[PDB]
Amino acid sequence: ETSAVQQKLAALEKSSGGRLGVALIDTADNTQVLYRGDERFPMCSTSKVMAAAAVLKQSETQKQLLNQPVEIKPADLVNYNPIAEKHVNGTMTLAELSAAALQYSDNTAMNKLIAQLGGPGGVTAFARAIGDETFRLDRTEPTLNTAIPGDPRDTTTPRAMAQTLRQLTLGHALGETQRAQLVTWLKGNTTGAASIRAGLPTSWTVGDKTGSGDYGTTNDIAVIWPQGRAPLVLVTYFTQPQQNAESRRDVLASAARIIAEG
């Protein structure tokens, strides 16, 4: 059975030619609205939130950890390194790496976070520690974005990621200073203007992390503070049938516009 919300999302999906996954949590009353909420989708760069959060968790017991400088070698650079390339043969602190990974989607920065955590499995272990039984990180950048249909590597579900993002930003999966820091990073994202944010009222404050990958995979996860009412968490995942499909951030904006109604 479907609601009119789900019907509108299904029509958007049909028009788009792809596969859309949505999870909304309204923290006013803890209700969820889901569309394909328990299907797996390739996370692509949305997985950077879990890696940054895992380092924040480490820093709760190692208070200067975020200011620890990490060497950037020429050999560390991958396919998209807008911030890390400014620091070759120099350093970036774990905070700088987190900001670059989250706010510019720097892929070298993500690999440094993964290395700090002992490999992709260290990111997954943190997910499990905070009650996310669904997330899995299997690979580093850039291969975590292959996004092959049916492949469970580097996937989660909309429901699981919405629940986790809520716990990380509005709940207490992290300590107070750390939750606030994650919120600061997400709010300052530079890559999200055409995704969820484009579908929401401009008066609403938004923190988000986008993702993109093969199969035209186009994703965004957000914490949203509407005017005059309790915050929301929204995940919008989208992927397409053919490997070289074009990005469709407009689909994410359209999904957010549907969800915001009412």
PDB file of C-alpha atoms in Angstrom:
ATOM      1  CA  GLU A   1       0.000   0.000   0.000  1.00  0.00           C
ATOM      2  CA  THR A   2       1.232   3.544  -0.737  1.00  0.00           C
ATOM      3  CA  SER A   3       0.618   7.057   0.473  1.00  0.00           C
ATOM      4  CA  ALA A   4       0.415  10.005  -1.890  1.00  0.00           C
ATOM      5  CA  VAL A   5       4.020  10.808  -0.882  1.00  0.00           C
ATOM      6  CA  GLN A   6       5.215   7.394  -2.002  1.00  0.00           C
ATOM      7  CA  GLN A   7       3.105   7.614  -5.151  1.00  0.00           C
ATOM      8  CA  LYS A   8       4.789  10.884  -6.098  1.00  0.00           C
ATOM      9  CA  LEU A   9       8.207   9.375  -5.421  1.00  0.00           C
ATOM     10  CA  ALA A  10       7.358   6.303  -7.517  1.00  0.00           C
ATOM     11  CA  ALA A  11       6.244   8.540 -10.387  1.00  0.00           C
ATOM     12  CA  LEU A  12       9.492  10.519 -10.139  1.00  0.00           C
ATOM     13  CA  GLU A  13      11.419   7.253 -10.180  1.00  0.00           C
ATOM     14  CA  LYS A  14       9.500   6.025 -13.225  1.00  0.00           C
ATOM     15  CA  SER A  15      10.093   9.282 -15.105  1.00  0.00           C
ATOM     16  CA  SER A  16      13.797   9.174 -14.211  1.00  0.00           C
ATOM     17  CA  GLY A  17      14.411   5.633 -15.519  1.00  0.00           C
ATOM     18  CA  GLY A  18      16.362   4.675 -12.415  1.00  0.00           C
ATOM     19  CA  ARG A  19      15.943   3.351  -8.892  1.00  0.00           C
ATOM     20  CA  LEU A  20      15.209   5.795  -6.062  1.00  0.00           C
ATOM     21  CA  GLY A  21      15.562   5.227  -2.318  1.00  0.00           C
ATOM     22  CA  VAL A  22      14.231   7.711   0.234  1.00  0.00           C
ATOM     23  CA  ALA A  23      14.035   7.787   4.007  1.00  0.00           C
ATOM     24  CA  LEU A  24      12.652  10.721   5.996  1.00  0.00           C
ATOM     25  CA  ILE A  25      12.621  10.866   9.786  1.00  0.00           C
ATOM     26  CA  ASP A  26      10.479  13.600  11.362  1.00  0.00           C
ATOM     27  CA  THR A  27      11.908  14.084  14.844  1.00  0.00           C
ATOM     28  CA  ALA A  28       8.752  15.911  16.001  1.00  0.00           C
ATOM     29  CA  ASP A  29       7.013  12.516  16.320  1.00  0.00           C
ATOM     30  CA  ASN A  30       9.645   9.966  15.189  1.00  0.00           C
ATOM     31  CA  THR A  31       7.637   8.947  12.143  1.00  0.00           C
ATOM     32  CA  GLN A  32       9.409   7.662   9.043  1.00  0.00           C
ATOM     33  CA  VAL A  33       8.426   7.993   5.372  1.00  0.00           C
ATOM     34  CA  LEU A  34      10.276   5.469   3.205  1.00  0.00           C
ATOM     35  CA  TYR A  35      10.513   4.637  -0.485  1.00  0.00           C
ATOM     36  CA  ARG A  36      12.521   1.464  -1.164  1.00  0.00           C
ATOM     37  CA  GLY A  37      13.710   2.124   2.381  1.00  0.00           C
ATOM     38  CA  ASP A  38      15.191  -1.349   2.973  1.00  0.00           C
ATOM     39  CA  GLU A  39      16.859  -1.825  -0.422  1.00  0.00           C
ATOM     40  CA  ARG A  40      20.623  -1.432  -0.641  1.00  0.00           C
ATOM     41  CA  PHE A  41      22.157   1.392  -2.663  1.00  0.00           C
ATOM     42  CA  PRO A  42      25.817   2.270  -3.359  1.00  0.00           C
ATOM     43  CA  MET A  43      26.720   5.013  -0.907  1.00  0.00           C
ATOM     44  CA  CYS A  44      29.568   6.591  -2.881  1.00  0.00           C
ATOM     45  CA  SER A  45      30.802   9.712  -1.113  1.00  0.00           C
ATOM     46  CA  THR A  46      27.945   9.681   1.404  1.00  0.00           C
ATOM     47  CA  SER A  47      30.091   7.080   3.190  1.00  0.00           C
ATOM     48  CA  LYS A  48      32.462   9.941   4.081  1.00  0.00           C
ATOM     49  CA  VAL A  49      30.077  10.895   6.906  1.00  0.00           C
ATOM     50  CA  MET A  50      30.634   7.558   8.644  1.00  0.00           C
ATOM     51  CA  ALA A  51      34.424   7.819   8.276  1.00  0.00           C
ATOM     52  CA  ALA A  52      34.546  11.365   9.665  1.00  0.00           C
ATOM     53  CA  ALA A  53      32.212  10.383  12.504  1.00  0.00           C
ATOM     54  CA  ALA A  54      34.412   7.386  13.340  1.00  0.00           C
ATOM     55  CA  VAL A  55      37.413   9.688  13.764  1.00  0.00           C
ATOM     56  CA  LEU A  56      35.315  12.075  15.854  1.00  0.00           C
ATOM     57  CA  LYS A  57      34.473   9.118  18.089  1.00  0.00           C
ATOM     58  CA  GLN A  58      38.172   8.297  18.428  1.00  0.00           C
ATOM     59  CA  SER A  59      38.819  11.916  19.428  1.00  0.00           C
ATOM     60  CA  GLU A  60      36.444  11.624  22.416  1.00  0.00           C
ATOM     61  CA  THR A  61      39.246   9.805  24.207  1.00  0.00           C
ATOM     62  CA  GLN A  62      42.235  11.415  22.381  1.00  0.00           C
ATOM     63  CA  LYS A  63      41.390  15.108  22.696  1.00  0.00           C
ATOM     64  CA  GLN A  64      44.055  16.498  20.307  1.00  0.00           C
ATOM     65  CA  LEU A  65      43.461  13.838  17.650  1.00  0.00           C
ATOM     66  CA  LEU A  66      41.679  16.165  15.254  1.00  0.00           C
ATOM     67  CA  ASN A  67      44.699  18.501  15.293  1.00  0.00           C
ATOM     68  CA  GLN A  68      47.192  15.698  14.586  1.00  0.00           C
ATOM     69  CA  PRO A  69      49.030  16.449  11.323  1.00  0.00           C
ATOM     70  CA  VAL A  70      48.996  13.693   8.713  1.00  0.00           C
ATOM     71  CA  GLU A  71      51.566  13.634   5.915  1.00  0.00           C
ATOM     72  CA  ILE A  72      50.297  13.932   2.332  1.00  0.00           C
ATOM     73  CA  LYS A  73      52.698  12.328  -0.113  1.00  0.00           C
ATOM     74  CA  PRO A  74      52.508  12.735  -3.889  1.00  0.00           C
ATOM     75  CA  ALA A  75      51.644   9.033  -4.110  1.00  0.00           C
ATOM     76  CA  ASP A  76      48.565   9.475  -1.916  1.00  0.00           C
ATOM     77  CA  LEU A  77      46.646  11.412  -4.575  1.00  0.00           C
ATOM     78  CA  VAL A  78      43.736   9.683  -6.314  1.00  0.00           C
ATOM     79  CA  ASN A  79      41.177  10.976  -8.836  1.00  0.00           C
ATOM     80  CA  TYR A  80      39.794  14.067  -7.098  1.00  0.00           C
ATOM     81  CA  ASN A  81      41.964  15.881  -4.600  1.00  0.00           C
ATOM     82  CA  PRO A  82      40.955  19.577  -4.617  1.00  0.00           C
ATOM     83  CA  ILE A  83      42.238  20.221  -1.080  1.00  0.00           C
ATOM     84  CA  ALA A  84      44.825  17.493  -0.617  1.00  0.00           C
ATOM     85  CA  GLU A  85      46.755  18.568  -3.712  1.00  0.00           C
ATOM     86  CA  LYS A  86      47.533  21.846  -1.908  1.00  0.00           C
ATOM     87  CA  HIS A  87      49.421  19.847   0.751  1.00  0.00           C
ATOM     88  CA  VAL A  88      51.590  17.388  -1.171  1.00  0.00           C
ATOM     89  CA  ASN A  89      54.869  16.944   0.724  1.00  0.00           C
ATOM     90  CA  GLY A  90      53.076  18.777   3.553  1.00  0.00           C
ATOM     91  CA  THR A  91      50.377  17.831   6.037  1.00  0.00           C
ATOM     92  CA  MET A  92      46.692  18.054   6.799  1.00  0.00           C
ATOM     93  CA  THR A  93      45.318  17.516  10.288  1.00  0.00           C
ATOM     94  CA  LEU A  94      42.559  14.980  10.815  1.00  0.00           C
ATOM     95  CA  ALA A  95      40.155  17.927  11.182  1.00  0.00           C
ATOM     96  CA  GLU A  96      41.388  19.403   7.903  1.00  0.00           C
ATOM     97  CA  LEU A  97      41.023  15.994   6.249  1.00  0.00           C
ATOM     98  CA  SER A  98      37.497  15.631   7.626  1.00  0.00           C
ATOM     99  CA  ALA A  99      36.529  19.095   6.402  1.00  0.00           C
ATOM    100  CA  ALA A 100      38.002  18.401   2.960  1.00  0.00           C
ATOM    101  CA  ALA A 101      36.332  14.997   2.674  1.00  0.00           C
ATOM    102  CA  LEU A 102      32.960  16.293   3.845  1.00  0.00           C
ATOM    103  CA  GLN A 103      32.792  19.812   2.423  1.00  0.00           C
ATOM    104  CA  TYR A 104      34.635  19.351  -0.914  1.00  0.00           C
ATOM    105  CA  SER A 105      34.297  15.551  -1.286  1.00  0.00           C
ATOM    106  CA  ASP A 106      38.071  15.222  -1.541  1.00  0.00           C
ATOM    107  CA  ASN A 107      38.851  11.554  -2.174  1.00  0.00           C
ATOM    108  CA  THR A 108      42.443  11.631  -0.927  1.00  0.00           C
ATOM    109  CA  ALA A 109      41.132  13.039   2.337  1.00  0.00           C
ATOM    110  CA  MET A 110      38.676  10.147   2.638  1.00  0.00           C
ATOM    111  CA  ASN A 111      41.486   7.629   2.106  1.00  0.00           C
ATOM    112  CA  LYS A 112      43.428   9.248   4.950  1.00  0.00           C
ATOM    113  CA  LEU A 113      40.398   8.941   7.209  1.00  0.00           C
ATOM    114  CA  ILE A 114      39.991   5.287   6.242  1.00  0.00           C
ATOM    115  CA  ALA A 115      43.688   4.645   6.947  1.00  0.00           C
ATOM    116  CA  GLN A 116      43.357   6.349  10.338  1.00  0.00           C
ATOM    117  CA  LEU A 117      40.607   3.831  11.140  1.00  0.00           C
ATOM    118  CA  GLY A 118      42.641   0.792  10.077  1.00  0.00           C
ATOM    119  CA  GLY A 119      41.012   0.293   6.689  1.00  0.00           C
ATOM    120  CA  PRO A 120      37.430   0.111   5.385  1.00  0.00           C
ATOM    121  CA  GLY A 121      36.600  -2.451   8.054  1.00  0.00           C
ATOM    122  CA  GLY A 122      37.357   0.143  10.717  1.00  0.00           C
ATOM    123  CA  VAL A 123      34.614   2.332   9.314  1.00  0.00           C
ATOM    124  CA  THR A 124      32.186  -0.599   9.327  1.00  0.00           C
ATOM    125  CA  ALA A 125      33.154  -1.468  12.895  1.00  0.00           C
ATOM    126  CA  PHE A 126      32.289   2.057  14.027  1.00  0.00           C
ATOM    127  CA  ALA A 127      28.910   1.763  12.280  1.00  0.00           C
ATOM    128  CA  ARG A 128      28.214  -1.452  14.181  1.00  0.00           C
ATOM    129  CA  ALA A 129      29.279   0.168  17.458  1.00  0.00           C
ATOM    130  CA  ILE A 130      26.625   2.867  17.028  1.00  0.00           C
ATOM    131  CA  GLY A 131      23.895   0.373  16.151  1.00  0.00           C
ATOM    132  CA  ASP A 132      24.045   0.578  12.344  1.00  0.00           C
ATOM    133  CA  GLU A 133      23.742  -3.085  11.330  1.00  0.00           C
ATOM    134  CA  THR A 134      23.433  -2.323   7.616  1.00  0.00           C
ATOM    135  CA  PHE A 135      26.280  -0.060   6.495  1.00  0.00           C
ATOM    136  CA  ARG A 136      29.337  -1.718   4.996  1.00  0.00           C
ATOM    137  CA  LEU A 137      32.504  -0.087   3.682  1.00  0.00           C
ATOM    138  CA  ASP A 138      34.578  -2.546   1.663  1.00  0.00           C
ATOM    139  CA  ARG A 139      36.915  -0.461  -0.490  1.00  0.00           C
ATOM    140  CA  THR A 140      38.915   2.724  -0.572  1.00  0.00           C
ATOM    141  CA  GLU A 141      38.657   5.648  -3.009  1.00  0.00           C
ATOM    142  CA  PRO A 142      38.018   5.506  -5.924  1.00  0.00           C
ATOM    143  CA  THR A 143      36.843   1.924  -6.290  1.00  0.00           C
ATOM    144  CA  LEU A 144      34.149   2.282  -3.603  1.00  0.00           C
ATOM    145  CA  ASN A 145      32.137   4.172  -6.288  1.00  0.00           C
ATOM    146  CA  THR A 146      31.805   1.380  -8.890  1.00  0.00           C
ATOM    147  CA  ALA A 147      28.126   1.124  -7.917  1.00  0.00           C
ATOM    148  CA  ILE A 148      27.437  -2.078  -9.871  1.00  0.00           C
ATOM    149  CA  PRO A 149      23.753  -3.079  -9.679  1.00  0.00           C
ATOM    150  CA  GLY A 150      23.302  -5.980  -7.259  1.00  0.00           C
ATOM    151  CA  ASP A 151      26.750  -5.601  -5.685  1.00  0.00           C
ATOM    152  CA  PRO A 152      26.503  -5.242  -1.870  1.00  0.00           C
ATOM    153  CA  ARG A 153      29.987  -3.748  -1.506  1.00  0.00           C
ATOM    154  CA  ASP A 154      29.981  -0.198  -0.116  1.00  0.00           C
ATOM    155  CA  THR A 155      26.196  -0.094   0.291  1.00  0.00           C
ATOM    156  CA  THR A 156      23.587   0.737   2.883  1.00  0.00           C
ATOM    157  CA  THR A 157      19.822   1.226   2.907  1.00  0.00           C
ATOM    158  CA  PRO A 158      17.957   4.552   3.106  1.00  0.00           C
ATOM    159  CA  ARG A 159      16.352   3.573   6.402  1.00  0.00           C
ATOM    160  CA  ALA A 160      19.650   2.611   8.029  1.00  0.00           C
ATOM    161  CA  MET A 161      21.511   5.708   6.863  1.00  0.00           C
ATOM    162  CA  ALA A 162      18.702   8.033   7.974  1.00  0.00           C
ATOM    163  CA  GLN A 163      18.653   6.425  11.414  1.00  0.00           C
ATOM    164  CA  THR A 164      22.426   6.682  11.676  1.00  0.00           C
ATOM    165  CA  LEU A 165      22.562  10.279  10.464  1.00  0.00           C
ATOM    166  CA  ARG A 166      19.929  11.166  13.058  1.00  0.00           C
ATOM    167  CA  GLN A 167      21.911   9.435  15.809  1.00  0.00           C
ATOM    168  CA  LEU A 168      25.117  11.173  14.733  1.00  0.00           C
ATOM    169  CA  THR A 169      23.781  14.733  14.377  1.00  0.00           C
ATOM    170  CA  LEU A 170      20.707  15.061  16.617  1.00  0.00           C
ATOM    171  CA  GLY A 171      21.122  12.082  18.945  1.00  0.00           C
ATOM    172  CA  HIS A 172      24.124  11.164  21.036  1.00  0.00           C
ATOM    173  CA  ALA A 173      26.089   8.540  19.087  1.00  0.00           C
ATOM    174  CA  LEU A 174      28.874  11.128  19.483  1.00  0.00           C
ATOM    175  CA  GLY A 175      29.863  13.291  22.421  1.00  0.00           C
ATOM    176  CA  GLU A 176      28.634  16.884  22.559  1.00  0.00           C
ATOM    177  CA  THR A 177      31.646  18.680  21.106  1.00  0.00           C
ATOM    178  CA  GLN A 178      31.882  16.007  18.401  1.00  0.00           C
ATOM    179  CA  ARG A 179      28.208  16.078  17.368  1.00  0.00           C
ATOM    180  CA  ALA A 180      28.405  19.850  17.093  1.00  0.00           C
ATOM    181  CA  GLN A 181      31.558  19.549  14.985  1.00  0.00           C
ATOM    182  CA  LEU A 182      29.900  17.087  12.613  1.00  0.00           C
ATOM    183  CA  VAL A 183      26.934  19.442  12.272  1.00  0.00           C
ATOM    184  CA  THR A 184      29.297  22.344  11.533  1.00  0.00           C
ATOM    185  CA  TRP A 185      31.017  20.349   8.810  1.00  0.00           C
ATOM    186  CA  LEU A 186      27.806  19.148   7.164  1.00  0.00           C
ATOM    187  CA  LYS A 187      26.233  22.612   7.280  1.00  0.00           C
ATOM    188  CA  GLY A 188      29.234  24.095   5.438  1.00  0.00           C
ATOM    189  CA  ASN A 189      29.177  21.574   2.590  1.00  0.00           C
ATOM    190  CA  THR A 190      29.973  23.154  -0.778  1.00  0.00           C
ATOM    191  CA  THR A 191      28.742  20.403  -3.123  1.00  0.00           C
ATOM    192  CA  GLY A 192      25.044  20.206  -2.263  1.00  0.00           C
ATOM    193  CA  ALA A 193      23.359  23.199  -3.902  1.00  0.00           C
ATOM    194  CA  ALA A 194      21.693  21.177  -6.681  1.00  0.00           C
ATOM    195  CA  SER A 195      20.622  18.188  -4.553  1.00  0.00           C
ATOM    196  CA  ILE A 196      18.357  18.069  -1.452  1.00  0.00           C
ATOM    197  CA  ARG A 197      18.909  21.766  -0.738  1.00  0.00           C
ATOM    198  CA  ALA A 198      17.510  22.748  -4.127  1.00  0.00           C
ATOM    199  CA  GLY A 199      14.203  21.141  -3.228  1.00  0.00           C
ATOM    200  CA  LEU A 200      13.684  22.739   0.203  1.00  0.00           C
ATOM    201  CA  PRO A 201      12.648  26.225   1.351  1.00  0.00           C
ATOM    202  CA  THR A 202      15.616  28.594   1.447  1.00  0.00           C
ATOM    203  CA  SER A 203      14.826  29.574   5.067  1.00  0.00           C
ATOM    204  CA  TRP A 204      15.638  26.056   6.271  1.00  0.00           C
ATOM    205  CA  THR A 205      19.109  25.275   7.589  1.00  0.00           C
ATOM    206  CA  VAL A 206      20.625  22.167   6.026  1.00  0.00           C
ATOM    207  CA  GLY A 207      23.668  20.020   6.633  1.00  0.00           C
ATOM    208  CA  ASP A 208      24.328  17.462   3.915  1.00  0.00           C
ATOM    209  CA  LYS A 209      26.789  15.158   2.214  1.00  0.00           C
ATOM    210  CA  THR A 210      26.385  14.308  -1.463  1.00  0.00           C
ATOM    211  CA  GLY A 211      27.649  11.266  -3.303  1.00  0.00           C
ATOM    212  CA  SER A 212      28.174  10.305  -6.921  1.00  0.00           C
ATOM    213  CA  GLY A 213      29.501   7.316  -8.776  1.00  0.00           C
ATOM    214  CA  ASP A 214      29.151   4.997 -11.707  1.00  0.00           C
ATOM    215  CA  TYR A 215      25.695   3.988 -12.966  1.00  0.00           C
ATOM    216  CA  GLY A 216      24.784   7.642 -12.664  1.00  0.00           C
ATOM    217  CA  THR A 217      24.609   7.141  -8.921  1.00  0.00           C
ATOM    218  CA  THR A 218      23.533  10.421  -7.360  1.00  0.00           C
ATOM    219  CA  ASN A 219      23.031  10.607  -3.609  1.00  0.00           C
ATOM    220  CA  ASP A 220      22.555  13.042  -0.734  1.00  0.00           C
ATOM    221  CA  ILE A 221      22.000  12.671   3.004  1.00  0.00           C
ATOM    222  CA  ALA A 222      20.863  15.614   5.070  1.00  0.00           C
ATOM    223  CA  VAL A 223      19.894  16.946   8.462  1.00  0.00           C
ATOM    224  CA  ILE A 224      17.321  19.700   8.085  1.00  0.00           C
ATOM    225  CA  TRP A 225      16.070  22.398  10.448  1.00  0.00           C
ATOM    226  CA  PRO A 226      12.782  23.744   9.035  1.00  0.00           C
ATOM    227  CA  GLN A 227      11.382  27.085  10.101  1.00  0.00           C
ATOM    228  CA  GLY A 228       9.417  26.775  13.327  1.00  0.00           C
ATOM    229  CA  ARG A 229       9.366  22.991  13.834  1.00  0.00           C
ATOM    230  CA  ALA A 230      11.540  20.072  14.875  1.00  0.00           C
ATOM    231  CA  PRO A 231      14.383  18.930  12.618  1.00  0.00           C
ATOM    232  CA  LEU A 232      14.220  16.221   9.987  1.00  0.00           C
ATOM    233  CA  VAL A 233      16.662  13.740   8.526  1.00  0.00           C
ATOM    234  CA  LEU A 234      16.395  12.901   4.830  1.00  0.00           C
ATOM    235  CA  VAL A 235      18.283  10.389   2.708  1.00  0.00           C
ATOM    236  CA  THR A 236      17.855  10.364  -1.073  1.00  0.00           C
ATOM    237  CA  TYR A 237      19.737   7.667  -3.023  1.00  0.00           C
ATOM    238  CA  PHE A 238      19.461   7.231  -6.780  1.00  0.00           C
ATOM    239  CA  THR A 239      21.132   4.902  -9.255  1.00  0.00           C
ATOM    240  CA  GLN A 240      20.553   4.000 -12.891  1.00  0.00           C
ATOM    241  CA  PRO A 241      20.755   0.954 -15.155  1.00  0.00           C
ATOM    242  CA  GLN A 242      23.778   1.800 -17.338  1.00  0.00           C
ATOM    243  CA  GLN A 243      27.355   2.334 -16.202  1.00  0.00           C
ATOM    244  CA  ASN A 244      27.932   5.725 -17.835  1.00  0.00           C
ATOM    245  CA  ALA A 245      24.564   7.302 -17.017  1.00  0.00           C
ATOM    246  CA  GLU A 246      24.650  11.039 -16.337  1.00  0.00           C
ATOM    247  CA  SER A 247      24.269  12.556 -12.875  1.00  0.00           C
ATOM    248  CA  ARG A 248      20.703  13.369 -11.848  1.00  0.00           C
ATOM    249  CA  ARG A 249      20.911  15.733  -8.874  1.00  0.00           C
ATOM    250  CA  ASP A 250      17.580  17.169 -10.016  1.00  0.00           C
ATOM    251  CA  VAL A 251      15.952  13.882  -9.031  1.00  0.00           C
ATOM    252  CA  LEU A 252      17.182  14.382  -5.463  1.00  0.00           C
ATOM    253  CA  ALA A 253      15.890  17.952  -5.440  1.00  0.00           C
ATOM    254  CA  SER A 254      12.537  16.713  -6.742  1.00  0.00           C
ATOM    255  CA  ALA A 255      12.352  14.028  -4.042  1.00  0.00           C
ATOM    256  CA  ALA A 256      13.085  16.606  -1.335  1.00  0.00           C
ATOM    257  CA  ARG A 257      10.389  18.885  -2.744  1.00  0.00           C
ATOM    258  CA  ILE A 258       7.851  16.044  -2.558  1.00  0.00           C
ATOM    259  CA  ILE A 259       8.888  15.128   1.001  1.00  0.00           C
ATOM    260  CA  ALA A 260       8.706  18.704   2.233  1.00  0.00           C
ATOM    261  CA  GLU A 261       5.056  19.111   1.308  1.00  0.00           C
ATOM    262  CA  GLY A 262       2.619  19.451   4.156  1.00  0.00           C
TER     263      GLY A 262
END
